[model samples]
Target chain A: DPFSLVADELSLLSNKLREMVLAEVPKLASAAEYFFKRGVQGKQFRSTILLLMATALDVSELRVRQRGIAEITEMIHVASLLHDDVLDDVMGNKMSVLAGDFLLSRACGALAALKNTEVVALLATAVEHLVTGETMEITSSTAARYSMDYYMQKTYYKTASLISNSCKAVAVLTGQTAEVAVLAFEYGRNLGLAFQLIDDILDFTGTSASLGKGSLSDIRHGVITAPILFAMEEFPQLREVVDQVAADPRNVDIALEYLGKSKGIQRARELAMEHANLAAAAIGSLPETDNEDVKRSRRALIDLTHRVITRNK
Target chain B: LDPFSLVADELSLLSNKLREMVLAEVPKLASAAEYFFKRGVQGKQFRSTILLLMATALDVSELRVRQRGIAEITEMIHVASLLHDDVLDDADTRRGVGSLNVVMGNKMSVLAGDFLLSRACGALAALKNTEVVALLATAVEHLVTGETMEITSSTAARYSMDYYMQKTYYKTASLISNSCKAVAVLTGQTAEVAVLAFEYGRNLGLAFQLIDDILDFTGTSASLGKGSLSDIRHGVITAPILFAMEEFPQLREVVDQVAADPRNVDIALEYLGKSKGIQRARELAMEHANLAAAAIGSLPETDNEDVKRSRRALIDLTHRVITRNK
Candidate 1:
């Protein structure tokens, strides 16, 4: 596994995160702790990426501080998940909203402890991007929603910005030069874009058993994702069906049929591959280093890009 | 006409400054963040007004600019909380306009709240004072904790005035109290003075929300911008209801069955009318307001005209808190 390089650290991070989210209020403690429980998938992806980035930068002395960023990154991500669940009309709106706010407040407190103003600004901006991106999706004009430019921009803000800024925050924490820091950010940016592209693709190809969610769920919720946008490009007729899916759930089937007749899924995979290559190339562009640990971490990070693209669930 | 008149000019500038602070590249975000700051839609700016008063009351002009930052940050946090609360309560109207959740959607409302909070953090960090950051950040935590306490409380647990007051401190009092203390800290006040500032805010915020609960029963829908007895309608048992229950034991049965029958609210109101609930609630609010005044009175005597005026306005605000009908 690409994450095997930081397997030990990942385990430790899980325990720390659990403790960090502990609340005096019993119900909130449970709600905040829900995502951190064992056997929950996707809990450690951001933290793993951050840890590997820290190693790749050869910042051994700042491991403790770097780990704090990983913890804060995961906290922010989970906080957003709770709020997103509420927005999607999940169960217990009040509990989810309060728990989400609880996590964010704790994350901010942890952020203040870091005592690095620039890093604080970077992570804080990522939080803003998460909001802006979610807002864009909700308020986008139908015309704006169809454009790939808008899709990528929204995707970057929603998904890529946090990881990129977080990776840059790691660099900033380690006092890396601006050029090297940008490379770290570039790697995270491209990797995150590739990661989300695959996630969008999986929503189409993966079954409910594997994906743990109903297939075509996004389309059902009126979410026009990468695959559908691409399919609309090939079968322009699909655009009408996309618009009608909100009014009629049966249109999801028609949209799916149009997708099968087109190369939208294939094209999306190709796009993910392009981003994965760019992500790998970012590591290659970093200054040549003789440290074996750094070399291994660089390779692991590159491997992660491919892993992210190839995952089915 | 009111205590706010003392800081009229600063409050006006604060509205403009707040608008600029929340300005975002995203069009919808910019509009949603600015929604509550709009001319007619803006609420009383109560917290910011008090914070600005505290700034001048400290008798320091050199740090007034940073103190203004504290006020802006406090207002942003307040509005952000309101945005999220509207979604939680599924409220459609606020401050005499459609809530962000209604105008845009629940999703947009939630995001706008987050966006505002993130910007608040960025601005707070820019102040370069880690202590103030911790203070405000803890206040945010308290907000969530207080909200959770309210949401998760059992029917039996809701009757405890102690529990209600603790939750009130978390929800309403914490923000203003911490902001008040932050203003004092920014002005380089002594720790004792900072504690006094906090005491003033804590008592005033309690009094302010207590009166708010009272107004929900006493005020008209047109005057209050919402239906009367909104708290009990949502099954929230506040000061008035609790005090009424104390006077009329059977009112607890009515309060407990509030969600069961629509007539229960009327029944509870009847009990409240016959009992001394409103009167006792007013007395409690007046007591807290007096305590707030005492906090201001305890501050070191000042000579500057602006300082003295601000101090007096703060004391006057306490009276305004309990006396306002809506």
Candidate 2:
């Protein structure tokens, strides 16, 4: 509800982002649409956070070109989702691979047209991070203790890099000093990390109806997420359960039950809250100014921090 | 010496540069990267050959360091496409070698492809020419579109000759044409000259793919460096098969059956071979080859031996596209 103040801008951002992703080729356009699913779908988290961060920096009256950054970031995110689908072998592997590629190339094209080489370099590096992250995910051993740091690295690549860099990109465009730009980036970094932490938590605690995806889906695929990692910390027995689930995915219910009974879910929630607070602190420390625009933008970003931690879906 | 052998040194340098890029940007992906780079190094660098010769066609002195960057980027994107295409196609071998998917497993292959592509984007950014960046990026988009066309076209309503040509353009021609255009831009070629470079690549790429389709019916796995009639085995009806369908309209049912299940390709292949498919496909390839040579004809007359040799070599390559068995 707090995002209502920026609802109009966010919606406008959605439309333009879709337009940028729309391909001249019919099949690709439709496949991309299948993933983007009419622009207004999918929480629009990264793009919204970016626009809000724009407001935080006193960037009044968001420019259409600024939407270029928003659009490109959304495209990159969608591209990753499409590939994730292919990797997961969800329905329509053929369509997903092409759609992901189309979105990525379109993002690159939009970024180039955005005419900021620095931003291009930043986002390009983000893609490098994303791919290497996935590589680590597939290749990294499933061992529990050694995996936490690797998991954090992958999460930064999978979730945080796009948001953090794009936020910094906003600062770069808005004439923010390097010191202030890093703060904006820090806000996004913490928010992205927190967002992923909550997502991992929801996999254990939320329902399929609420999450809109299979609950405990990660462990079924042999992935060890935050809740499972924390649960393993409490009950080392989960390490065996995790391997069992990976071997016989039918064991997911038992693993989920074990996770729910342990303090793993609660601890993971605490960690998420800490990340959210770090994000809020980054926003709060934005040199206390009397400028109403700056104060309102700061308030909106801080409010977003609260909403992110509490969102069910 | 044959034209390909003449450019052997340049191709070698390009492959080495590409391997170096992977090592520098995505060191963690070396084994997977090696899996792909090894296949490419063993095979012909046809795209690089065309590009280097195109640069030389302009002027011997025009081969700037940036053009080398574009050439390596082109190969990287091509290798990336093959890596992903293998996953999507669910194939076991590529270029007569085991596919990265089957060898490295599908997940690593996909990420390896992505890693190469990100490396490509990084390389593209270093060129610092947004126009070329846009061109190359669009080429990659076209690869997706082309691959999508093949997979989605099994539906009867979607199957058509026009779709096939457009798909071929996206899959094969886009990268070559755009890369050629990129080299032209790097060399400060006039817009007219740049477009000419694109025309050369477009016609050549189309002709090359048409010949590839032709070889699918006529060549062997040993000769083509991959399985023969592989297009039909994949349930994709290439130009030769499409031309055959013009004569044996009833073959559509066979195509549909194979499309539904690729194991039925034997029947479809029989019907395709019996029709005028191979001959007609060869005719079309020749037509494109002629057009490609015509594009080279438009290159301004120059007495420079390097320019003359490159142009002659390009014309020679175009001729070889239609005639080469592999």
Candidate 3:
């Protein structure tokens, strides 16, 4: 039943979002349809967490307005994925580009409708951060790209801002105290970072069957993911292997072999677990509620964090 | 003096403000920003002019900062759209120079467009008006939807007058009309007066695009600074061509063939000229121009000289929009 908590809202969330996206411009419905196809099979993790948080403190009534925030969070995530795929894959991909723009615009409309300037500012700042983080990846000082601090900041913006801000928006909508809202945001932030770190680890160990994309995909993209970044501390020459792998597709196994043998995968798993613990602790810090359903949802959130670090796919 | 010189000082400063916005923060975007924003590839800041002029007409005493904020924000959204437009159109030059996509490449151009868009939203958040925020954000959504419709609408439906009008409303009229309404909302004007402002912008926006479609047939690439007949060549079927097809159904074959190979656009142009299409398009523009002038007349009559001067200038602007060669 705990596992079913997030899954319960999945069908409703997907349908409403598609409806809102092409409300006026039904001609562009196909664009929305194409972009969201891959994601439909994927976990609606961001929305699940935010919705669970809505009833965490009290058995508060879930407002349609609160669900609107959840929808916006998913829209922003989908939009970024669309953009990231185009950047990672060098193609004209005009459909991807235009679809991304369409979704982001729809997200803006949903954000403004929340009718809370503070929430509007939060989501808008999140959008600005998404771009700033993406721009930094391309424009950061060459040395900074490899640094841990830069990686965390970039990860926070690229992955966590949307999650954290939408969490706070839910708390704000449900009339939670400032303390409660901050707790919700902290929970989302840690969860998001852990979610991304686990994703990076899975890139090496996860199969195309599990991830729906090629394994070791990061190396081919010239990306220095956490596993590869850790591998460099042991074998500094692994850095050279990265460029080799990108330049010569035949060299991917050499880099993958280096990462697998160097305890780099172990290190990435440990890092992911560290954040996973932080995320669970944030959920523990939430104000205790006497209501049984509220307590169940809180436990589900903590359980969800464990699933994040342990899941193979 | 240029007729648009009415706001020349503010226009120059407005240009400076938008350039600084893109350049001031991100050093990475400087070359890209300079390539597009600094080069003046964006011709006459018509949206900025209308927004500024509307502020004065609404209430001359409105805060200078708020008025300036809305104008710059409007221009940012407009410029951002142009960046994306070039990528979609694969245009080479705009306003007599290389487009950002052509110069900086599509990747940077897309990111730059997104950056500008985010900055526009950030600026709107600073203004702190939820209604106006909703209005401006809705306009941005309309922009994407408009472009989506343009690219995806069935070619057969593309020639219909209804589809053309709906597309025009989304792509052209929504931003202007919404931003003009934002000005009225900012000044705490009556809903009646705000509707009037929106009406003025809507009619003017329609007239402006109609005139632009006309120039695609009439103007030279030298005068327009980009290739003319580009819409049809790009397979964009617009108003004149739709009308031209009606005049001579024979042109449909020629239009479809030209769409297959743009080399025949010149041949299609020859027939477009002889059709009554151009005259009808002009007359339609004149009707919208009159509606725009009438929207001005509907505003609460005021004695303030500056407001009256703006009212007069707006009427003159309608004429200029229709008559300007470029």
Candidate 4:
């Protein structure tokens, strides 16, 4: 597993995160630490990726500032997750909003501690993109929702922006050239896109036991993902069914039926694979290095892209 | 006639420039942010008004432009809190218009709030003052802490005046106080003057929120642009309720069981009306308002007309805050 490569760093991050999220108010502390608790699988994915990216840049010493980037990245990701729960109605909206704000504030404080205005602006912009992407999803017209270009744009804003910017930030912290920073960003961008595409695919293909949630949950919530969008193109009749799913949930089964018969799932996997390949290619494009540690991290990052697409949950 | 009129020109400039500051490439974000920022829909620019006046009162011409950005950032932070609060409260109306969550869904409203906060952070970072950045960021943390305290407070905690005041400071006073200090620090004012500025904002903010709580009991929905008794309806125990409970210990049961029965709000209001809760609450607000004025009086004497008028306006604002029903 790619996470194993950064196991020690990831362990250290878990402790720092807990300390940072502590609040004078007991309930506030608990609510802020909800996702950071042990036994929650996949919580440290962003930080793990960031740690690997840090070493991949061949920093002679992994400075505390670089490690700080990984911590900040995960804090931001979890903060967005908390607010996303508010939108999704998975938790009490009031507590979710406040806890999310608390996390973001702490993240901002940590960012300021870095004393790098450029890094602060980059992460702040990523936060703006998170909201912009959510706004686009909630406000998109039916016609705009059907467009692949719109979907891709939204995906990049919601998923790729944080990872891409944080990767760039890591490179910047390592004193890498602008060219190297761009390459790091490109790697994160493609990997993020591939990760999200697979996530959408799992909503349809994974079982409740495997995925830890109900299948076809997105369609039930009236969310149209790439698979459904692709299916609508292959089977035009599915468009009307997709529209009706919001009014009557019975259409979900019919939409599934159409999706099962078409090449929608196949096309989505192809797209994800394309992104994963691009992610790997970005790693290959990085400056050649003789350092053994850099080579291991670079290969791990490339391998992580394939893992993203292959993960079932 | 308006106490804020001294800074009216600066406030107007802030209103016009705020839209461009929050302008986004995403059409929906731009519109949602504009929804609150536009002239007719924008709620009273109270925080920015105070910050701008405070800036002028300090008599620093060199950092005037940067200080104006502080006013805008303060306003953005305030509005962003309102947006999220509306979502948490499930409110439908605000400032005489449908709340953003009502016009758009909860998702957009939440994201819009986040967008404004991010923009505020970006603008704050641009100011290149790490001290100011830490202050504002801690203020945001206090806001969440305050809200969480309200949400998760035990019934026992609710009865404590100290708890309520601490929560109030976190929720309402922290932003303005920190912003006031930021303005002073930006202009290289004496640390003594900066502390006084913070004290002015802190005391005024407390008085402002005290009056707001009082108005919830006294103002009508038409006057307040929201439902009266909203705090009690949401099971929020404010100053009035706390004081009312002090007068009638029997009222504790009603306060404890608020939102449990339809008549609990009316029962609590009757107890409040019969007791001297509102009167005592008004006295407390007056005391804080006096402290706010005292903070201004303690500042080093100045002869500049702009400084004089701005300081007087700051004093006048305390009275306005105590007197306003909404």
Tell me chain A's TM-score in each of the predictions: 0.84, 0.80, 0.81, 0.84
> Candidate 3: misplaced stretches above 4 Å?
A1-40, A58-62, A87-92, A138-141, A207-214, A247-263, B1-3, B23-26, B29-35, B39-42, B60-62, B220-227, B261-270
Query: What TM-score does candidate 1 get on C-alpha atoms?
Result: 0.82
Sort the predicted structures by lDDT, highest score first.
Answer: 1, 4, 3, 2
Local accuracy of candidate 1 as per-residue lDDT tens digits, A1-313: 5765675576557545555334443676575577578577565888888999888985444798899999899889988888877655435766667778888988988887887878888888999999888778777777999998899999999999999999999999988999999998999899999988898888888755765533777888888888889998888999999899879989988988998899898988899899999999999998889999999999999999889887856
Better of 1 and 3 by TM-score: 3
Candidate 4 lDDT, tens digit per residue, A180-277? 99999998899999988898899989755665543888899888899999998899888899889879989998998998999988899999999999
Candidate ordering by DockQ (highest first): 4, 1, 3, 2
Residue ranges of candidate 4 with Cα displaced over 4 Å: A1-39, A58-63, A85-95, A200-274, A284-291, A309-313, B215-235, B257-280, B300-303, B319-326
DockQ of 1: 0.29
Each model's fraction of native contacts: 0.64, 0.49, 0.52, 0.66
Give the Cα error of residue B78 in candidate 1, in Å: 1.2
| lDDT (tens digit, per residue) of candidate 3 on A29-83 | 6876886785555577787897788767663235688888889887877777776
Poorest stretch of ten by lDDT in candidate 1 chain A:
A16-25
In model 1, the runs with Cα more than 4 Å from the true position are: A1-39, A59-65, A86-95, A203-270, A285-292, B215-230, B244-250, B261-280, B323-326
Candidate that beats the other on DockQ, 3 or 4, i.e. the better one: 4
Error of 4 at A36 (Å): 9.7
